[PDB]
Amino acid sequence: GIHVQHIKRRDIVLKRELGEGAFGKVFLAECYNLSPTKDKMLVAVKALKDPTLAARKDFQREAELLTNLQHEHIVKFYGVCGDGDPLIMVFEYMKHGDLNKFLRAHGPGELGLSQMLHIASQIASGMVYLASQHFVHRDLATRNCLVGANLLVKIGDFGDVYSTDYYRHTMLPIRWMPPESIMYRKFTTESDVWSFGVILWEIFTYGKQPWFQLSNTEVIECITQGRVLERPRVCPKEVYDVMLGCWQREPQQRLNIKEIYKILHALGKAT
């Protein structure tokens, strides 16, 4: 089966808490004997706090998954740490934090069109990769993207901080979900494409919450009714057309992520 890379606990030097959740705890840390270059490098370390029996089993399958789910625009997974007490995963560190915060902090030094396209294109690139791996994310949103140096952007999936972005039972990011996911919890590459359209809207509104005006009930009604977010002020019409292509009511009518990437990448290269 899949051999997950193991990192010695003693090679991890914890530096600072980045965050906490009901389930996880994330640290910034230095890791020795990892880099091919440097002596030590920065990493992000997630330690599970007193996990269930299923949680343990879940952790191991996720580690095996992440071992090969590897791409320039997917947050880098390095391996698991220690020997289970507790369960620790080690990821690269992305020094500019989550994209939603980043967006809101550069909104009315501002992001120009070329920067917003570069951001969007990188995310679509990661999604092209995910689709090639039959991987359905289910919670694509800028809060789950991270930003590194030079506006490098990568997709993760993080376990609180954005509770408002989920609806009560497990939490669903309804504002990012298409009608068939809300109704049937049918998640596919096509519902991720729908989510990406909303990511585009987030980027071009500097990280505003979709349907901020509406209640969760009203959002369900809204999406089901086939209503869509309006074009953001600084969103070029072709980019909005891409958004609408993501928001086709019938999943098989949606643009595929390869088409979306091809368009956004060209536009970003041209501007």
Ligand SMILES: N#Cc1ccc(-c2cnc3ccc(NCc4ccccc4)nn23)cc1
């Ligand atoms: N599993 C996992 C995993 C978690 C974080 C990272 C990571 C890597 N660099 C940064 C920088 C900033 C950063 N804030 C987002 C965040 C902070 C606290 C808790 C949850 C999310 N998370 N983060 C990588 C993998």
Ligand SMILES: [Cl-]
């Ligand atoms: Cl330590």
